[PDB]
Design a protein around this ligand. Structure first.
Ligand SMILES: CCOP(=O)(Cc1ccc(C)cc1)OCC
Ligand SMILES: CCOP(=O)(Cc1ccc(C)cc1)OCC
Ligand SMILES: [Zn+2]
Ligand SMILES: [Zn+2]
Ligand SMILES: [Zn+2]
Ligand SMILES: [Zn+2]
Ligand SMILES: [Zn+2]
Ligand SMILES: [Zn+2]
Lengths: 330, 331
């Protein structure tokens, strides 16, 4: 409760400092990295790529990252522990389920799913003893019956442990609204939930509505933009055509309405990516060579240049995260 | 074509002995066993059960089993090795893809998949050095565009290595026919292919047509029957309501038509099963307490009893498999 679980062990809340709330070391699939490492060059190579990128973000002031990769995202905790130790960056691991669960998970009940999330948070991931510090869930527009179950089990495990919940949404379709509804029906406080991929929409009306309820708003894909890369149909589809400035501005808008306390910013960056078109990383790395350092290097100066007080900026990147991540029982 | 790859290393063809061609140590999902072993009691309990069952099969004469679990079936090669060693039964591992691929697989090209299968056969599984001795693929009725790629990649890897291909079909939909077409278009010889779940249809005309063309016919789920358990929907939907005898008789029927050399028999058994309803294992263990010994203990005697010469029985359980498994390069 006074401590947060990292892949290197528990840390005190003051030890977190500047935290990136939605990132990935690798975006893959369960067992993929162990079965076909060469798809990323090799395991060592992906590891070195990640350490370099984490060292650079650390130089920009980043002290902690929350890796929101779930079992189905192909999360490899041993890999997380190893790059964390090498780059000297704290990494918070996650439990929960994304939108590519295999049959062994899709056929489970809410009760069984609750047990699995609890196992990861209390006993540890696999046989490592490494505990999860957050629960990641997802909807892809209108919730499927299984997705519904996932949300309910995420909510029950949160209640029992104090651990927060972070989500993936189809912003455009106001997914946030349905998720809020389910979480509330389980008795979970909005304050323990972050509504993700929210910078993906321009609808300030949707956003302030959730903020007004106590939810945290995840503006985590700032550098995502295919402007110029309109050549590429795949990239255009994933990245979008809104510029990074446009996304960054959403931050200002919310602050302007009195919501600085409910904002969480991130890059939604990764060093490896197999669950997409081949070579999509190359494309991404071209669009954003700063990688995870983008927020500190480009978004912060930028917002300051627009009237946002530095002190306000420190609250969003240091204060908001600490409050969110500290394990809080009802 | 001298040696076959097992989880304990290469064996000579004469060492294979009585072989079960379509089995599983565990039926799961990639990464599941390592992430939630308690689902099976424990990984230790699972190993123990599996060792017991294999010793029982061994007591009955079984010397080798082919575990057709692919990556997406959650195949755990280290688990296989340990149980092989403890029970002293040879186990042949597989590469290929079944019907639950994750995004990282589903977005791959034919060229990309070829490389993954070759990796498993030549380089080995994961970092173990353990090499696959068969390629498993599947269709669930009419092939999806992804499935078609998988079949092409499997045909190409077989062509380069000489390792056989074994399939999963929706028998009632005559899936073997579309699979044959694809394989044939790739230049693959039918004798390198086993059309699985073939005991799931009563349509002998579909089976004889494939047999006539040179394909091997996998009558692999003999003990699967929901007979007397129709009070259970999930069970019945999976095991079917045709009796074990009905299935076994398809064996004699193909023999009677002159295709003994094209027949492969198995139990399609397992010691763990997470890719289905919870508790499915209990139901199965109720239905067939003999586990993988069912073939030797009940099917052989039954068949002998229906007039099949012992000699023919030996050909099917020893001979046919040795020929199918021998890595065979195209002339
Ligand atoms: C075997 C898996 O442990 P468990 O059942 C009970 C358990 C939880 C935490 C610790 C430290 C030990 C044991 O997990 C709780 C959901
Ligand atoms: C996994 C990297 O090995 P490779 O590229 C080439 C390779 C094949 C066999 C052996 C023994 C070593 C290396 O695998 C073939 C597809
Ligand atoms: Zn997402
Ligand atoms: Zn996002
Ligand atoms: Zn993400
Ligand atoms: Zn099958
Ligand atoms: Zn079968
Ligand atoms: Zn099978």
């Amino acid at each position: 409760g006074d401590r947060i679980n990292t892949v290197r062990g528990p840390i005190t809340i003051s030890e977190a400092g500047f935290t990136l709330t939605h990132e990935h070391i690798c975006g893959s699939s369960a067992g993929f990295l162990r079965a076909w490492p060469e798809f990323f060059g090799s395991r060592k190579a992906l590891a070195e790529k990640a350490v370099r990128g984490l060292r650079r973000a650390r130089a920009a002031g980043v002290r902690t990252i929350v890796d929101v990769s779930t079992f189905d995202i192909g999360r490899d905790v041993s890999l997380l522990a190893e790059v964390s130790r090498a780059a000297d960056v704290h990494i918070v691991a996650a439990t929960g389920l994304w939108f590519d669960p295999p049959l062994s998970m899709r056929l489970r009940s809410v009760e069984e799913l609750t047990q699995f999330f609890l196992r990861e948070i209390q006993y540890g991931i696999e046989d490592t003893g490494i505990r999860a510090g957050i629960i990641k869930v997802a909807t892809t527009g209108k919730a499927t019956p299984f997705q519904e179950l996932v949300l309910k089990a995420a909510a029950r495990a949160s209640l029992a442990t104090g651990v927060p919940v972070t989500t993936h949404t189809a912003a455009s379709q106001r997914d946030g609204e349905q998720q809020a509804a389910i979480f509330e029906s389980e008795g979970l406080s909005p304050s323990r939930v972050c509504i993700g991929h929210s910078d993906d929409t321009d609808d300030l009306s949707y956003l302030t509505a959730l903020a007004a309820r106590g939810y945290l708003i995840g503006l985590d894909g700032i550098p995502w933009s295919a402007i110029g890369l309109e050549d590429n149909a795949s990239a255009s589809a994933l990245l979008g055509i809104r510029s990074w400035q446009t996304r960054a501005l959403l931050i200002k808008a919310l602050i302007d309405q009195g919501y600085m306390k409910q904002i969480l910013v991130s890059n939604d960056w990764t060093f490896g990516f197999s669950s997409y078109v081949t070579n999509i990383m190359d494309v991404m790395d071209r669009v954003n060579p700063d990688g995870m350092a983008f927020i500190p290097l480009r978004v912060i100066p930028f917002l300051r240049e627009k009237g946002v007080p530095q002190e306000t900026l420190a609250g969003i990147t240091v204060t908001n995260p600490a409050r969110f991540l500290s394990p809080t029982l009802r």
